[PDB]
């Protein structure tokens, strides 16, 4: 059906906070449909992004609907009633339905709140720093679960995600499964990852954290491919002229030409669930992958942690690889 | 075949102005090759565009971001974190290699424009927007558009280019597939708003209206007057072939998605698949219907060689009889 993305007419931090928490509750509600969660989640990710806001366009055959503008929410908390403007096209029945979804949290959430701290939603969202700290903290928790263990303890210790706005584990898992089911959501996340990579926002604290998370997301499932290119092939080893490599060498030539052809889709094959992702799996070139692991076993200090029981691991071309890089 | 795009390490407007006037000369120089012109033209277009600069980084589609502009020219040659001595003197010579058709050895009709002290940000942005708006005008389909953009204040008359300088930029854009690929992104960002109509992107969106769906006129007029009416004459057997052909063309437009409106600018081979010569009967039927229904259809050209004279009269007769 319709994917509803609400956006505001005001830079009011308290309104930006209420829309955030309203949308968070719709993603986590029992009764919402997938289309409601996808749009409520894209609204959250769009609040600190001017770019995603310009990407959500109804013009060209939209499954997306801006719903157009939302002035404010109902003033008394517990009234998650939206106030849209003229030319909005939202009927009262839908404002009550949305207000009812925001109160329909599962019982696994202590104190009927998505947060570990039961007094977070009750905070007065007066200043933009209180919102931006809250907005960045929960959005960061959604970025870690987008990926394919406890990096929360890392991100808490280092550049901030505020422990005050930690989500309860049940809220994180629900967000994780919505992002997995939502192809439309992950399609817009790539534009954020692309923007964090090409940085006119080096000083922006949010895109700096997105770019670090993006290091783990980008080229996920491509490790075996890039390690093979690095070791088996980064130098002209004379053992490359073995006839047993002749087939896999042309295979990697097509695989590398494939990476160039796809352009920027190549960085997000696992995130977009592209069928081409498996084409880069080491099982399509097990001899060279075996030859490259042996080279990197003796050349690099860090490859103690990676070589862990692969089924197609040859273990004979592994010994050929280490002996080739043994002496230079 | 390296396309070098210059990026600067400082916002100061005097350096931004000097980089634009330096790249403008390379585009218009006698001795430069396309590769040099494409890169200097991309540098000009990216100066007011934080988004195109974000598409020049290793992207797109090659393009090496020569950038690394500390970088004020000593005079007309650069100072690079990146590259060599011989290229500095070569680029410096290209900037002073203008053709004799440009008066006073300057691209501008006013001989004392380049001598202006580019001290402030507004004198650069007014100069940068005026120069780029003259570029945008010649990139698709100019007689009276400049008179319109002059009166609307979109081109400051002080920064008008000489006609020869406009025509060279017109052909460099025409030859540059990579330049037009980055221009589509600017048009795509022009629409969908920018900063309560950013003065630059509001003008780009205005120019965009001219570029989008260029060369699709016969296709859309046929879809409107021949297939929007659904009149019984459509079931003539002589339309049966062109009916299915227009159905594949319509499927093709939907499949292309975002690139559909930019076929002429993107040099798509699919563009002339949409030409009216591929369905001349239904096209003549649609023109006859439009001649009667729409007042703006006359005077149209109607001078195409494949226009069928009798199927035009069938369209008129089918449309006129709304009695």
């Amino acid at each position: 059906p319709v994917i509803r993305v609400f956006i505001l007419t005001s830079n009011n931090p308290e309104l930006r906070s209420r829309l955030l928490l309203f949308c968070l509750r719709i993603v986590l509600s029992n009764g919402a449909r997938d289309s409601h969660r996808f749009g409520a989640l894209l609204t959250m990710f769009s609040l600190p992004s001017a770019t995603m806001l310009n990407h959500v366009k109804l013009a060209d055959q939209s499954p997306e609907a801006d719903i157009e503008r939302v002035e404010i929410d109902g003033f008394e908390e517990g009234s998650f009633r939206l106030i849209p403007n003229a030319r909005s096209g939202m009927s009262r029945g839908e404002i009550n339905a949305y207000a009812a979804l925001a109160e329909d949290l599962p019982d696994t959430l202590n104190h009927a709140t998505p947060f570990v701290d039961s007094e977070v939603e009750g905070t007065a969202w007066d200043e933009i720093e209180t919102f931006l700290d809250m907005c960045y903290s929960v959005l960061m928790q959604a970025w870690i679960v987008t990926c394919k263990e406890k990096r929360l303890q890392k991100y808490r210790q280092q550049g901030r995600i505020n422990p005050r706005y930690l989500l309860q584990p049940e809220a994180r898992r629900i967000i994780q499964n919505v992002i997995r089911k939502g192809m439309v959501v992950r399609h817009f996340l790539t534009f954020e990852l692309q923007l964090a990579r090409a940085q006119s926002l080096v000083s922006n604290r949010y895109y700096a954290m997105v770019g670090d998370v993006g290091k783990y997301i980008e080229n996920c499932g491509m490790g075996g491919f890039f390690l093979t290119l690095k070791y088996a092939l980064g130098t002209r080893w004379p053992t490359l002229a073995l006839a047993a490599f002749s087939g896999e060498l042309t295979k990697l030539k097509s695989l590398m030409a494939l990476y160039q052809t796809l352009g920027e889709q190549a960085r997000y094959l696992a995130l977009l669930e592209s069928p081409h992702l498996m084409d880069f799996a080491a099982a399509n070139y097990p001899l060279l992958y075996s030859y490259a692991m042996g080279i990197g076993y003796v050349l690099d200090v860090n490859m103690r942690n990676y070589a862990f029981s692969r089924s197609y691991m040859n273990k004979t071309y592994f010994q050929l690889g280490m002996e080739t890089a043994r002496k230079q | 075949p390296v396309i070098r795009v210059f990026i600067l390490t400082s916002n100061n407007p005097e350096l931004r102005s000097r980089l634009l006037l330096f790249c403008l000369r390379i585009v218009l120089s006698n001795g430069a090759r396309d590769s040099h012109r494409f890169g200097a033209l991309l540098t000009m277009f990216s100066l007011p565009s934080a988004t195109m600069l974000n598409h020049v980084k290793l992207a797109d589609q090659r393009v090496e971001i020569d950038g690394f502009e500390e970088g004020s020219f000593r005079l007309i040659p650069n100072a690079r974190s990146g590259m060599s001595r011989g290229e500095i003197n070569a680029y410096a010579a290209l900037a002073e290699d203008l053709p004799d058709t440009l008066n006073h050895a300057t691209p501008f009709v006013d001989s004392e424009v380049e001598g202006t002290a580019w001290d402030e940000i507004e004198t650069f942005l007014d100069m940068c927007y005026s120069v780029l708006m003259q570029a945008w005008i010649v990139t698709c389909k100019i007689e009276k558009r400049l008179q319109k953009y002059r009166q609307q204040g979109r081109i400051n008359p002080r920064y008008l280019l000489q006609p020869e300088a406009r025509r060279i930029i017109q052909n460099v854009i025409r030859k540059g597939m990579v330049v037009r690929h980055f221009l589509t992104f600017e048009l795509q960002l022009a629409r969908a708003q920018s900063l309560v109509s950013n003065r630059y992107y509001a003008m780009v969106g205005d120019v965009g209206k001219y570029i989008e769906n260029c060369g699709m006129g016969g296709f859309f007029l046929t879809l409107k007057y021949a297939l929007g009416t659904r009149w019984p004459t459509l079931a003539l057997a002589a339309f049966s072939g062109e009916l299915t052909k227009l159905k594949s063309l319509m499927a093709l437009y939907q499949t292309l998605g975002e690139q559909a409106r930019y076929l002429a600018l993107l040099e798509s081979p699919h563009l002339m698949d949409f030409a009216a010569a591929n369905y001349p009967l239904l096209y003549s039927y649609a023109m006859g219907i439009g001649y009667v229904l729409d007042v703006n259809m006359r005077n149209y050209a109607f001078s195409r060689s494949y226009m069928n004279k009798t199927y035009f009269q069938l369209g008129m007769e089918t449309a006129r009889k709304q009695m």
């Binding site: - | 989008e212 879809l223 297939l227 929007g228 159905k247 319509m250 939907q254």
Partner: peptide
Amino acid sequence: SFSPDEINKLIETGLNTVE
């Protein structure tokens, strides 16, 4: 001359007439 929206794509007119 045309709006950036194409409800004009009446393929329904096409498939109706090629019965």
